[PDB]
Amino acid sequence: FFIGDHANMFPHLKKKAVIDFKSNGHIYDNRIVLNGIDLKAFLDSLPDVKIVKMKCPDGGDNADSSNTALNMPVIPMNTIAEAVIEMINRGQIQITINGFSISNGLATTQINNKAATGEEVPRTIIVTTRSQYGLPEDAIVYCNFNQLYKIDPSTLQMWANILKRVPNSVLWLLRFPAVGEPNIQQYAQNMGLPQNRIIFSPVAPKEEHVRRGQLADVCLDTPLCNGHTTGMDVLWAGTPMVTMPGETLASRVAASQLTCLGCLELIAKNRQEYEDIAVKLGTDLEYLKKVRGKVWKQRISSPLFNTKQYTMELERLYLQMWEHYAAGNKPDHMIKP
Amino acid sequence: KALEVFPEFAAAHSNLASVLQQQGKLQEALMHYKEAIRISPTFADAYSNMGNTLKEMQDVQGALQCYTRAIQINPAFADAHSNLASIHKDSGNIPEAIASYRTALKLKPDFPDAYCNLAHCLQIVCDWTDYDERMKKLVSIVADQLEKNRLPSVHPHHSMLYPLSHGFRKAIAER
Amino acid sequence: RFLCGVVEGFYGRPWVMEQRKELFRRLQKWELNTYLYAPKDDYKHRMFWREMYSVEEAEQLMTLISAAREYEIEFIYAISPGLDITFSNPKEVSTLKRKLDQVSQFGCRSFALLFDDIDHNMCAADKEVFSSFAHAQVSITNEIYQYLGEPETFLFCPTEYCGTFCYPNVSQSPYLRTVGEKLLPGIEVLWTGPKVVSKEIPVESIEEVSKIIKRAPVIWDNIHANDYDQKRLFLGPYKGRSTELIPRLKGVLTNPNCEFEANYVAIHTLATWYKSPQMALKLALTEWLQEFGVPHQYSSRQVAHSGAKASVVDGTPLVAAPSLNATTVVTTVYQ
Ligand SMILES: O=c1ccn([C@@H]2O[C@H](COP(=O)(O)OP(=O)(O)O)[C@@H](O)[C@H]2O)c(=O)[nH]1
């Protein structure tokens, strides 16, 4: 019953690209990335292009075609590449290269406040970097973006288990509200984590609030009350999430989007195997590739974000209510329309 | 009848304004509270109630300063602390709202709705001190308000973020 | 001289010289003519206006009057007597006057006596010798006014200053009538709009309050002020008047918020556009960038979410009837 809305007002996220990372050739996608509606138009302007197909489990089938949204355009580094890198280091807002406007995400509001909140589309090519939010460029970053109140001691013990059992990792928090972050900090070290294991970032406008989700690896989810909008935001960026449905409707919510994602492996039946799934993702260092590639691939083909089918189905349900009631038939459990 | 008989009766104005607030119409209720205050300067209860209305139609933190007036006229009046803390938490200034809730509760040891609101605010700032006992006491008091069967302390939205029976939350929603 | 400035009437210990110094620089270099001190964090001297200043805080007052000197912005001291004062004890009047002399030869030349947020339970003897709070208050007010040689600038904070407290309406306020009558224009009354959230829509209300107070009122500009709300900010350009309000006002006194430079840019938009709103929005955009103080990419806290609503309490009082209390006796009533 939960509609995908980000397919329309944020179409620029449909594509993905990275410049050649400082890591020698290896693809750590979510440290410094490229996005934007005109990013495809920037492919010609690349003095040296690099394309590798996103090799999801097809076996040479179904993927040897173009599938531009389903590959990696990575640009081997240039002098202009270091220019935009130290852009994001030092922080000039935006410039133009060969008629293509390159803008750092962290300040895109100054391009257009109207486009900052998401009312207007961020209108040029947008580059983002992990370091601009202080993030370890070569670590494993679990993330979570909901309001801080939907976290309890038991869930904190859960993620502390996952974090200890995967030492080379950091957990993305939000000072949202700002004041509660030290309050949860004391709980974090009181059961034995230093003040480096969790990195908490400030509140942002939506467009950045969801763009920054790309830089993370895997999203951790709150079983006490899942993120209704926030989780779907994380989906639309392409970053997966793993949850344990509880019993309340909200506890069930996170699993709904994942069922529409068509992949049950991110849905947990009990606390311990939830630990197991989270750590299997964070430790496989290959399974992230499958999961993220497939989510990016079929997220658009997922029946969630495309509002056509949902609109027609809801209209048909309206038909069902009127063709039930108007015949005098009493209200009932209206099932399998 | 009381007013026309006794055109300076304060408590009668207070009650009439209370029922008019119950009647939803406020301008006359606000006016009655105003005249009651004029005829009796120290009627901090009328401040509390008139602030209740004055934010009830729409917030004017003039209601907040009215609550402060009622506070300073007699600090023993815990309800004014509760109301001003509620206004603060509406504004989002959670910490001192928590402080005022905590005050008001310690002034009167058992005050259900204020305590559950404070619990919500604490859980907002994630203070898990006294966690399990907070849960169990709030379950106790909401159960108590449920078999005595009028208005539940916990707001329905906060309700399911607590371990309460589906029957309990169903009853709260019904109420 | 049209009064326009900032009040340190909100929270805050008297801070570093640098923060207040930047404040005064932005006052003087951007035509802010008015600055006040009466912080709610007046340590204990808000109620103990009776308390003498130690030479230490007196020397910090030297620092303050100094800063108001090299930066030339008229500092005004202002304290609230109506909490622990009695209007029939001229000894205590002498106490107020000695305090004023101390801080006056300390350089201060202007004063406001804050009659807001005061006790409402005055001595019965005072009640018959002085009719209402207004009469005794304004009597001692004119007394101070004459005592200071009729200071040219002498502000004033009344007990009733808002739509809520102008019982029951402005037109029917005996208190405000007496304030207008017994006052001389040498004292400048403060008043914060027909609503405490002074969204100053009514010019006619300004006229009514003006005539019933017999002067152009001074707007204690608290719309930003955390004296009642800090997060209540003008997202758009500053407002709260029209052009025609310019003669009908004598001063605008604002209390800033944690978005310090946001308050600065709002008040300087007011100062310029004083001597049309969207250019202030243009200046808002302009001086937001020139600010670069607390940008937060426009997105500080109070971001939209799925918030619930608070719940509040009230009860109903009962009444009693007093019985007879007579106590008389005679001796020989028969024949
Ligand atoms: O830094 C932040 C934090 C939250 N949000 C938005 O706030 C909402 C999440 O809060 P809420 O609890 O109201 O929604 P829910 O989490 O229940 O889905 C979503 O719309 C988010 O896009 C945002 O844009 N930026």
PDB file of N, CA, C and O in Angstrom, chain A residues 146-196:
ATOM      1  N   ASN A 146      16.663   7.357  10.290  1.00  0.00           N
ATOM      2  CA  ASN A 146      15.404   7.726  10.919  1.00  0.00           C
ATOM      3  C   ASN A 146      15.620   8.679  12.085  1.00  0.00           C
ATOM      4  O   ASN A 146      16.761   8.967  12.457  1.00  0.00           O
ATOM      5  N   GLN A 147      14.530   9.165  12.673  1.00  0.00           N
ATOM      6  CA  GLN A 147      14.640   9.951  13.888  1.00  0.00           C
ATOM      7  C   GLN A 147      15.202   9.086  15.006  1.00  0.00           C
ATOM      8  O   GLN A 147      14.986   7.873  15.051  1.00  0.00           O
ATOM      9  N   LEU A 148      15.930   9.723  15.915  1.00  0.00           N
ATOM     10  CA  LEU A 148      16.676   8.969  16.907  1.00  0.00           C
ATOM     11  C   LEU A 148      15.799   8.255  17.919  1.00  0.00           C
ATOM     12  O   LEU A 148      16.293   7.356  18.602  1.00  0.00           O
ATOM     13  N   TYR A 149      14.523   8.613  18.039  1.00  0.00           N
ATOM     14  CA  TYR A 149      13.744   8.013  19.111  1.00  0.00           C
ATOM     15  C   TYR A 149      13.366   6.571  18.818  1.00  0.00           C
ATOM     16  O   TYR A 149      13.130   5.808  19.758  1.00  0.00           O
ATOM     17  N   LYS A 150      13.325   6.167  17.553  1.00  0.00           N
ATOM     18  CA  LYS A 150      12.964   4.789  17.228  1.00  0.00           C
ATOM     19  C   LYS A 150      14.158   3.852  17.372  1.00  0.00           C
ATOM     20  O   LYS A 150      14.457   3.045  16.493  1.00  0.00           O
ATOM     21  N   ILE A 151      14.845   3.956  18.506  1.00  0.00           N
ATOM     22  CA  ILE A 151      15.963   3.083  18.854  1.00  0.00           C
ATOM     23  C   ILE A 151      15.888   2.809  20.347  1.00  0.00           C
ATOM     24  O   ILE A 151      15.673   3.730  21.141  1.00  0.00           O
ATOM     25  N   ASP A 152      16.055   1.546  20.733  1.00  0.00           N
ATOM     26  CA  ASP A 152      15.933   1.181  22.139  1.00  0.00           C
ATOM     27  C   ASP A 152      17.204   0.488  22.620  1.00  0.00           C
ATOM     28  O   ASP A 152      18.094   0.204  21.808  1.00  0.00           O
ATOM     29  N   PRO A 153      17.337   0.208  23.921  1.00  0.00           N
ATOM     30  CA  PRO A 153      18.528  -0.529  24.378  1.00  0.00           C
ATOM     31  C   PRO A 153      18.724  -1.862  23.682  1.00  0.00           C
ATOM     32  O   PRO A 153      19.861  -2.221  23.365  1.00  0.00           O
ATOM     33  N   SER A 154      17.646  -2.604  23.427  1.00  0.00           N
ATOM     34  CA  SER A 154      17.787  -3.920  22.811  1.00  0.00           C
ATOM     35  C   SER A 154      18.330  -3.808  21.393  1.00  0.00           C
ATOM     36  O   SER A 154      19.245  -4.540  20.999  1.00  0.00           O
ATOM     37  N   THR A 155      17.776  -2.887  20.607  1.00  0.00           N
ATOM     38  CA  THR A 155      18.276  -2.685  19.254  1.00  0.00           C
ATOM     39  C   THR A 155      19.710  -2.173  19.267  1.00  0.00           C
ATOM     40  O   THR A 155      20.525  -2.559  18.417  1.00  0.00           O
ATOM     41  N   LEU A 156      20.043  -1.303  20.221  1.00  0.00           N
ATOM     42  CA  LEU A 156      21.421  -0.841  20.315  1.00  0.00           C
ATOM     43  C   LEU A 156      22.357  -2.000  20.616  1.00  0.00           C
ATOM     44  O   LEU A 156      23.463  -2.072  20.068  1.00  0.00           O
ATOM     45  N   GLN A 157      21.935  -2.916  21.489  1.00  0.00           N
ATOM     46  CA  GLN A 157      22.728  -4.116  21.724  1.00  0.00           C
ATOM     47  C   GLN A 157      22.855  -4.940  20.451  1.00  0.00           C
ATOM     48  O   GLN A 157      23.913  -5.521  20.185  1.00  0.00           O
ATOM     49  N   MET A 158      21.791  -4.989  19.644  1.00  0.00           N
ATOM     50  CA  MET A 158      21.874  -5.704  18.374  1.00  0.00           C
ATOM     51  C   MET A 158      22.994  -5.136  17.518  1.00  0.00           C
ATOM     52  O   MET A 158      23.893  -5.862  17.061  1.00  0.00           O
ATOM     53  N   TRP A 159      22.958  -3.825  17.290  1.00  0.00           N
ATOM     54  CA  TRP A 159      23.930  -3.284  16.352  1.00  0.00           C
ATOM     55  C   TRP A 159      25.318  -3.251  16.963  1.00  0.00           C
ATOM     56  O   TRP A 159      26.309  -3.273  16.234  1.00  0.00           O
ATOM     57  N   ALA A 160      25.414  -3.199  18.290  1.00  0.00           N
ATOM     58  CA  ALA A 160      26.718  -3.325  18.928  1.00  0.00           C
ATOM     59  C   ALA A 160      27.292  -4.714  18.707  1.00  0.00           C
ATOM     60  O   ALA A 160      28.498  -4.867  18.491  1.00  0.00           O
ATOM     61  N   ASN A 161      26.440  -5.739  18.749  1.00  0.00           N
ATOM     62  CA  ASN A 161      26.884  -7.084  18.401  1.00  0.00           C
ATOM     63  C   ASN A 161      27.410  -7.116  16.973  1.00  0.00           C
ATOM     64  O   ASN A 161      28.514  -7.609  16.712  1.00  0.00           O
ATOM     65  N   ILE A 162      26.638  -6.557  16.039  1.00  0.00           N
ATOM     66  CA  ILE A 162      27.044  -6.556  14.634  1.00  0.00           C
ATOM     67  C   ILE A 162      28.345  -5.780  14.447  1.00  0.00           C
ATOM     68  O   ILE A 162      29.209  -6.162  13.647  1.00  0.00           O
ATOM     69  N   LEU A 163      28.501  -4.673  15.175  1.00  0.00           N
ATOM     70  CA  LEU A 163      29.669  -3.812  15.012  1.00  0.00           C
ATOM     71  C   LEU A 163      30.920  -4.448  15.595  1.00  0.00           C
ATOM     72  O   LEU A 163      31.988  -4.417  14.974  1.00  0.00           O
ATOM     73  N   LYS A 164      30.815  -5.016  16.796  1.00  0.00           N
ATOM     74  CA  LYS A 164      31.941  -5.739  17.365  1.00  0.00           C
ATOM     75  C   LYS A 164      32.325  -6.906  16.477  1.00  0.00           C
ATOM     76  O   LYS A 164      33.508  -7.117  16.193  1.00  0.00           O
ATOM     77  N   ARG A 165      31.331  -7.652  15.999  1.00  0.00           N
ATOM     78  CA  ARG A 165      31.618  -8.837  15.217  1.00  0.00           C
ATOM     79  C   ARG A 165      32.109  -8.477  13.817  1.00  0.00           C
ATOM     80  O   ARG A 165      32.608  -9.351  13.100  1.00  0.00           O
ATOM     81  N   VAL A 166      31.995  -7.209  13.421  1.00  0.00           N
ATOM     82  CA  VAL A 166      32.635  -6.686  12.211  1.00  0.00           C
ATOM     83  C   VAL A 166      33.445  -5.446  12.582  1.00  0.00           C
ATOM     84  O   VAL A 166      32.946  -4.318  12.442  1.00  0.00           O
ATOM     85  N   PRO A 167      34.691  -5.597  13.046  1.00  0.00           N
ATOM     86  CA  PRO A 167      35.401  -4.440  13.631  1.00  0.00           C
ATOM     87  C   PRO A 167      35.652  -3.285  12.672  1.00  0.00           C
ATOM     88  O   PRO A 167      35.572  -2.120  13.083  1.00  0.00           O
ATOM     89  N   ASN A 168      35.961  -3.565  11.407  1.00  0.00           N
ATOM     90  CA  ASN A 168      36.355  -2.508  10.481  1.00  0.00           C
ATOM     91  C   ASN A 168      35.142  -1.799   9.898  1.00  0.00           C
ATOM     92  O   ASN A 168      35.015  -1.680   8.675  1.00  0.00           O
ATOM     93  N   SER A 169      34.254  -1.311  10.758  1.00  0.00           N
ATOM     94  CA  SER A 169      32.999  -0.732  10.313  1.00  0.00           C
ATOM     95  C   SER A 169      32.645   0.485  11.151  1.00  0.00           C
ATOM     96  O   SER A 169      33.067   0.620  12.302  1.00  0.00           O
ATOM     97  N   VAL A 170      31.859   1.367  10.548  1.00  0.00           N
ATOM     98  CA  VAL A 170      31.312   2.536  11.221  1.00  0.00           C
ATOM     99  C   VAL A 170      29.818   2.604  10.942  1.00  0.00           C
ATOM    100  O   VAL A 170      29.346   2.230   9.862  1.00  0.00           O
ATOM    101  N   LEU A 171      29.077   3.097  11.928  1.00  0.00           N
ATOM    102  CA  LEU A 171      27.631   3.220  11.838  1.00  0.00           C
ATOM    103  C   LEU A 171      27.247   4.687  11.680  1.00  0.00           C
ATOM    104  O   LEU A 171      27.692   5.541  12.454  1.00  0.00           O
ATOM    105  N   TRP A 172      26.415   4.959  10.673  1.00  0.00           N
ATOM    106  CA  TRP A 172      25.982   6.297  10.275  1.00  0.00           C
ATOM    107  C   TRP A 172      24.802   6.676  11.164  1.00  0.00           C
ATOM    108  O   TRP A 172      23.752   6.034  11.115  1.00  0.00           O
ATOM    109  N   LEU A 173      24.963   7.710  11.974  1.00  0.00           N
ATOM    110  CA  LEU A 173      23.860   8.234  12.770  1.00  0.00           C
ATOM    111  C   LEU A 173      23.556   9.664  12.347  1.00  0.00           C
ATOM    112  O   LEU A 173      24.300  10.291  11.594  1.00  0.00           O
ATOM    113  N   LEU A 174      22.446  10.191  12.844  1.00  0.00           N
ATOM    114  CA  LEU A 174      22.067  11.561  12.556  1.00  0.00           C
ATOM    115  C   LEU A 174      21.754  12.255  13.864  1.00  0.00           C
ATOM    116  O   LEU A 174      21.061  11.692  14.717  1.00  0.00           O
ATOM    117  N   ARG A 175      22.277  13.465  14.023  1.00  0.00           N
ATOM    118  CA  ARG A 175      21.920  14.273  15.174  1.00  0.00           C
ATOM    119  C   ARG A 175      20.525  14.831  14.969  1.00  0.00           C
ATOM    120  O   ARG A 175      20.333  16.023  14.735  1.00  0.00           O
ATOM    121  N   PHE A 176      19.548  13.936  15.068  1.00  0.00           N
ATOM    122  CA  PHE A 176      18.176  14.209  14.647  1.00  0.00           C
ATOM    123  C   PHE A 176      17.243  13.495  15.603  1.00  0.00           C
ATOM    124  O   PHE A 176      16.730  12.411  15.308  1.00  0.00           O
ATOM    125  N   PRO A 177      16.999  14.077  16.782  1.00  0.00           N
ATOM    126  CA  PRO A 177      17.410  15.405  17.251  1.00  0.00           C
ATOM    127  C   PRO A 177      18.893  15.501  17.587  1.00  0.00           C
ATOM    128  O   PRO A 177      19.540  14.484  17.796  1.00  0.00           O
ATOM    129  N   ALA A 178      19.427  16.723  17.602  1.00  0.00           N
ATOM    130  CA  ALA A 178      20.853  16.900  17.844  1.00  0.00           C
ATOM    131  C   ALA A 178      21.240  16.488  19.259  1.00  0.00           C
ATOM    132  O   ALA A 178      22.289  15.864  19.465  1.00  0.00           O
ATOM    133  N   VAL A 179      20.407  16.821  20.246  1.00  0.00           N
ATOM    134  CA  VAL A 179      20.799  16.672  21.644  1.00  0.00           C
ATOM    135  C   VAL A 179      20.990  15.216  22.050  1.00  0.00           C
ATOM    136  O   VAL A 179      21.844  14.919  22.892  1.00  0.00           O
ATOM    137  N   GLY A 180      20.232  14.290  21.467  1.00  0.00           N
ATOM    138  CA  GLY A 180      20.276  12.909  21.919  1.00  0.00           C
ATOM    139  C   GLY A 180      21.522  12.142  21.523  1.00  0.00           C
ATOM    140  O   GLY A 180      21.699  11.007  21.981  1.00  0.00           O
ATOM    141  N   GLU A 181      22.365  12.713  20.663  1.00  0.00           N
ATOM    142  CA  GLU A 181      23.561  12.002  20.213  1.00  0.00           C
ATOM    143  C   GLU A 181      24.559  11.733  21.331  1.00  0.00           C
ATOM    144  O   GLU A 181      25.037  10.592  21.434  1.00  0.00           O
ATOM    145  N   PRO A 182      24.953  12.703  22.165  1.00  0.00           N
ATOM    146  CA  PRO A 182      25.789  12.337  23.321  1.00  0.00           C
ATOM    147  C   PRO A 182      25.101  11.360  24.254  1.00  0.00           C
ATOM    148  O   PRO A 182      25.756  10.490  24.850  1.00  0.00           O
ATOM    149  N   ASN A 183      23.781  11.488  24.393  1.00  0.00           N
ATOM    150  CA  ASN A 183      23.031  10.590  25.260  1.00  0.00           C
ATOM    151  C   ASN A 183      23.176   9.146  24.803  1.00  0.00           C
ATOM    152  O   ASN A 183      23.410   8.249  25.620  1.00  0.00           O
ATOM    153  N   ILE A 184      23.051   8.900  23.498  1.00  0.00           N
ATOM    154  CA  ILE A 184      23.291   7.547  23.004  1.00  0.00           C
ATOM    155  C   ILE A 184      24.775   7.210  22.996  1.00  0.00           C
ATOM    156  O   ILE A 184      25.137   6.030  23.086  1.00  0.00           O
ATOM    157  N   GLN A 185      25.649   8.212  22.888  1.00  0.00           N
ATOM    158  CA  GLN A 185      27.078   7.941  22.937  1.00  0.00           C
ATOM    159  C   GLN A 185      27.437   7.257  24.243  1.00  0.00           C
ATOM    160  O   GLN A 185      27.994   6.151  24.243  1.00  0.00           O
ATOM    161  N   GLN A 186      27.024   7.855  25.364  1.00  0.00           N
ATOM    162  CA  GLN A 186      27.332   7.273  26.668  1.00  0.00           C
ATOM    163  C   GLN A 186      26.900   5.818  26.739  1.00  0.00           C
ATOM    164  O   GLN A 186      27.628   4.974  27.267  1.00  0.00           O
ATOM    165  N   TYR A 187      25.729   5.497  26.188  1.00  0.00           N
ATOM    166  CA  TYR A 187      25.321   4.099  26.117  1.00  0.00           C
ATOM    167  C   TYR A 187      26.256   3.293  25.226  1.00  0.00           C
ATOM    168  O   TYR A 187      26.471   2.100  25.468  1.00  0.00           O
ATOM    169  N   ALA A 188      26.813   3.922  24.189  1.00  0.00           N
ATOM    170  CA  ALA A 188      27.678   3.198  23.263  1.00  0.00           C
ATOM    171  C   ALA A 188      28.985   2.779  23.929  1.00  0.00           C
ATOM    172  O   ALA A 188      29.398   1.617  23.830  1.00  0.00           O
ATOM    173  N   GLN A 189      29.662   3.712  24.607  1.00  0.00           N
ATOM    174  CA  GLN A 189      30.892   3.286  25.279  1.00  0.00           C
ATOM    175  C   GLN A 189      30.614   2.544  26.577  1.00  0.00           C
ATOM    176  O   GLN A 189      31.455   1.749  27.008  1.00  0.00           O
ATOM    177  N   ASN A 190      29.463   2.779  27.209  1.00  0.00           N
ATOM    178  CA  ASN A 190      29.176   2.121  28.477  1.00  0.00           C
ATOM    179  C   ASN A 190      29.109   0.611  28.322  1.00  0.00           C
ATOM    180  O   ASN A 190      29.406  -0.122  29.270  1.00  0.00           O
ATOM    181  N   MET A 191      28.723   0.125  27.146  1.00  0.00           N
ATOM    182  CA  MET A 191      28.827  -1.295  26.859  1.00  0.00           C
ATOM    183  C   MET A 191      30.052  -1.619  26.012  1.00  0.00           C
ATOM    184  O   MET A 191      30.234  -2.774  25.616  1.00  0.00           O
ATOM    185  N   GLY A 192      30.903  -0.629  25.740  1.00  0.00           N
ATOM    186  CA  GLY A 192      32.222  -0.907  25.209  1.00  0.00           C
ATOM    187  C   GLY A 192      32.516  -0.583  23.758  1.00  0.00           C
ATOM    188  O   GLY A 192      33.144  -1.392  23.067  1.00  0.00           O
ATOM    189  N   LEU A 193      32.081   0.577  23.270  1.00  0.00           N
ATOM    190  CA  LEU A 193      32.571   1.017  21.972  1.00  0.00           C
ATOM    191  C   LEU A 193      33.216   2.391  22.085  1.00  0.00           C
ATOM    192  O   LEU A 193      32.676   3.284  22.746  1.00  0.00           O
ATOM    193  N   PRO A 194      34.358   2.595  21.435  1.00  0.00           N
ATOM    194  CA  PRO A 194      35.003   3.910  21.463  1.00  0.00           C
ATOM    195  C   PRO A 194      34.216   4.927  20.649  1.00  0.00           C
ATOM    196  O   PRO A 194      33.261   4.607  19.938  1.00  0.00           O
ATOM    197  N   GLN A 195      34.647   6.185  20.757  1.00  0.00           N
ATOM    198  CA  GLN A 195      33.990   7.303  20.094  1.00  0.00           C
ATOM    199  C   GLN A 195      34.415   7.460  18.642  1.00  0.00           C
ATOM    200  O   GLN A 195      34.236   8.539  18.065  1.00  0.00           O
ATOM    201  N   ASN A 196      34.984   6.413  18.047  1.00  0.00           N
ATOM    202  CA  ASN A 196      35.305   6.400  16.631  1.00  0.00           C
ATOM    203  C   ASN A 196      34.435   5.450  15.829  1.00  0.00           C
ATOM    204  O   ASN A 196      34.337   5.608  14.608  1.00  0.00           O
TER     205      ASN A 196
END
